[PDB]
């Protein structure tokens, strides 16, 4: 079973957005579909639901009249038309499904899409290596990373040697610079025995600015 939220990003206060929930592996006719939302650092607030066969929806006070859930049975998809948007509705937006007819827990969820409600501009991150120390103890453990700096909005996804290097990887939560812009880092620790030999490349994705950097962090 899979549920894949699309069409979420940056949007002006007052402005519109239409979240897409793509099902596969089951017919959305045979169940209810929900849109649950997590504001930065807060808990899950349920927002709306729909029985795709009839299209009988239910919505939360905070969102009633303003947002509108619907379902295209053909593409196996659910939508959240979102309008009159504000700082309140800046959160992650999950799309989930009730089980069967008599088991009404929420067994499957999307990965979620961040909706940020600013009218600040999108901005693309620069990437800069964090290069392993010359000193290199003598042959124990070295660190190295990519700084990712001055992007808006969230989020940023960093991988390493394209998915091939996962152990020792610490992609820090981002920090908001007074400039109103974001910056994080990602670091990996690795056997100092291997700085020349092996190649370490960080892959930086910021979809908001369609950005793909593949920076090769060399010693110095």
């Amino acid at each position: 079973v899979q549920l894949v939220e699309s069409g979420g990003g940056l949007v002006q206060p007052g402005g519109s957005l239409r979240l897409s929930c793509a099902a596969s592996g089951f017919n959305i006719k045979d169940t209810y579909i929900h849109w649950v939302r997590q504001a930065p650092g807060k808990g899950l607030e349920w927002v709306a639901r729909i029985y795709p066969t009839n299209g009988y929806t239910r919505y939360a006070d905070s969102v009633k009249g303003r947002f509108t859930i619907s379902a295209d049975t053909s593409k196996n998809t659910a939508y959240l038309q979102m309008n009159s948007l504000r700082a309140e509705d800046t959160a992650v937006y999950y799309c989930s499904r009730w089980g069967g007819d008599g088991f009404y827990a929420m067994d499957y969820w999307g990965q979620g899409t961040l909706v940020t409600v600013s009218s600040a501009s999108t901005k693309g991150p620069s990437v800069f290596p964090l290069a392993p120390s010359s000193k290199s103890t003598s042959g124990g453990t070295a660190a190295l990373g990519c700084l990712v700096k001055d992007y808006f909005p969230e989020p940023v996804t960093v991988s390493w040697n394209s998915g091939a290097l996962t152990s020792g990887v610490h992609t820090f939560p981002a920090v908001l610079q007074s400039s109103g812009l974001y910056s994080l880092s990602s670091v990996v620790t690795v056997p100092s025995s291997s700085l020349g030999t092996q190649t370490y490349i960080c892959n930086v994705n910021h979809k908001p600015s369609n950005t793909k950097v593949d920076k090769k962090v060399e010693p110095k």
Partner: protein, 212 residues
């Protein structure tokens, strides 16, 4: 709209502890309750459905219980991979509602940070801003202090911290602290150090470099 009152809001337990989290519904809700675990960045996973049933693919050590309006999720033997917030939801009435949720931090042996300091890149320096990054790797507890010393002169208002949620394997944390300076400002000094203070250290550790 039924309210769901969650206890506690936070919890540290150790590996091989029974931990138990309670949820109290305002009005009655039958068996109409599910227990979900959400990991950092990741979306919630079903753990328990109808208060006492153990979803498919949920390890046996999880279990749920109903005594009247009071609902209890139990981890018989806490494992590092259990780090998460866990939320109780009732679905008896619309809107289905959630507890504020319970933050389970694993509690392990005091661990000393490894410290590394990274000079700005050549290529940032060419853009007239200097990023000096102090890293603290795989310490416990989550509570630390990093100070920045430029030519032994302590700094303030010009650095920014960020801490990883607790690692899933070793229950440790890591911290990034970032001093920023106009290339102009950076080039007026040579000795960059960051002082680090933590439980696992019987003395403060300082990593440093000279600009050159």
């Amino acid at each position: 709209d039924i309210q769901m009152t969650q206890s506690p809001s936070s919890l540290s337990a150790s590996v091989g502890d029974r931990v138990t989290i309670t949820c109290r519904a305002s009005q009655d809700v039958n068996t109409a309750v599910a227990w979900y675990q959400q990991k950092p960045g990741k979306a919630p996973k079903l753990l328990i459905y109808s208060a006492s049933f153990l979803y498919s693919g949920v390890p046996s050590r999880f279990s749920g219980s109903r005594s009247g309006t009071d609902f209890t999720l139990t981890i018989s033997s806490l494992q590092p991979e259990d780090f998460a917030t866990y939320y109780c939801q009732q679905h008896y009435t619309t809107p289905p509602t959630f507890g504020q949720g319970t933050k389970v931090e694993i509690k392990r042996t005091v661990a000393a940070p490894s410290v590394f300091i990274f000079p700005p890149s050549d290529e940032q320096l060419k853009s007239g801003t200097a990023s000096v990054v102090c890293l603290l790797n795989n310490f416990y507890p989550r509570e630390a202090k990093v100070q920045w010393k430029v030519d032994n002169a302590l700094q303030s208002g010009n650095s920014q911290e960020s801490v990883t949620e607790q690692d899933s394997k070793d229950s440790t944390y890591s911290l990034s602290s970032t001093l920023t300076l106009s290339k102009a400002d950076y080039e007026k000094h040579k000795v960059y150090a960051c002082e680090v203070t933590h439980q696992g250290l019987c003395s403060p550790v300082t990593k440093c470099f000279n600009r050159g």
